[PDB]
Amino acid sequence: RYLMDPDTFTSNFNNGIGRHKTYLCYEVERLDNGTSVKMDQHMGFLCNESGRHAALRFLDLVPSLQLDPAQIYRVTWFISWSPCFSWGCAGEVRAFLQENTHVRLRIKAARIYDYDPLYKEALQMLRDAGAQVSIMTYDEFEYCWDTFVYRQGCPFQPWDGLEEHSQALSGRLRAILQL
DNA sequence: TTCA
Ligand SMILES: [Cl-]
Ligand SMILES: [Cl-]
Ligand SMILES: [Zn+2]
């Protein structure tokens, strides 16, 4: 495979500044007799394109992953913006999850996409569809740096405010999802 | 610098 340019990672996953783009790093994992099987072929990253948000481009590539319906797979997204509602993507993901019940999705967002006035409805719909929605933490940024980025042995260097932003967004998300 |  290949790895993300470090400048692209830092400018798109900084949880204190937005970009007019969305990146999505993904991995697929399976638990077998209590062990983590995570294939290299099931890991990658992508970005949004004109008229197609990143979440939908991940849906586009699921057939190529060749998942087996006899097994449960845990799919994790590290996504620079939380999925939207108004352009249809939360509904598309919900439908996908209902049609592919062997897929269990974890959505870890660096930022909340509240440009969408219906951003709360997106998160609640994804939760209602069985997805585990959370806000990326320090450890998850470091994991993505170490796992998906062409870093060349350089360790993760956190930006100022990372923790303050992450914990603020996590509190926001708790209130959005609380019942 | 909110999927411009
Ligand atoms: Cl979306
Ligand atoms: Cl707020
Ligand atoms: Zn969308």
B2 C1' – A67 CA distance, angstroms?
33
Helices A162-177 and A138-148: angle between axes, nearest 10 degrees:
110
| The nucleotide closest to A81 (CA, C1' atoms) | B3
Of the candidates A119, A84, A109, the one whose C-alpha atom is nearest the C-alpha of residue A13 is A109
Is residue A133 within 8 A of residue A116, CB to CB? The reply is no
Tell me which method was used to determine the 3D structure: X-ray
3-state secondary structure chain A: CCCECHHHHHHHHCCCCCCCCCEEEEEEEEEECCEEEECHHHCEEEECECCECHHHHHHHHHHHHCCCCCCCEEEEEEECCCCCCCCCHHHHHHHHHHHCCCEEEEEEECCCCCCCCCHHHHHHHHHHCCCEEEECCHHHHHHHHHHHECCCCCCCCCCCCHHHHHHHHHHHHHHHHCC
* Distance in angstroms between the alpha carbons of the first and the last residue of chain A: 42
Per the structure block, which two tokens stand in for A95? Answer: 């439908």
Q: How far apart are CA A59 and CA A41, in angstroms?
A: 16
Asked if the Cβ of residue A166 lies within 7 A of any atom of strand B, the reply is no
Contacts with A105 (C-beta within 8 Å, 6 or more apart), sequence order: A75, A76, A77, A93, A97, A126, A130, A131, A132
Is residue A90 within 8 A of residue A67, CB to CB? The reply is no
Q: How far apart are CA A78 and CA A76, in angstroms?
A: 7
* Closest residue (CA to C1') to nucleotide B1 in the complex: A19
Cα A160 from chain centroid (whole Å): 22
Token match 């992450």: residue?
A166
Q: Label the pairing between strands A103-109 and A73-79.
A: parallel
Contacts with A129 (C-beta within 8 Å, 6 or more apart), sequence order: A93, A94, A97, A98
Provide the positions of strand B that have an atom within 7 A of a protein CB. 1-4
Token match 């006035």: residue?
A117
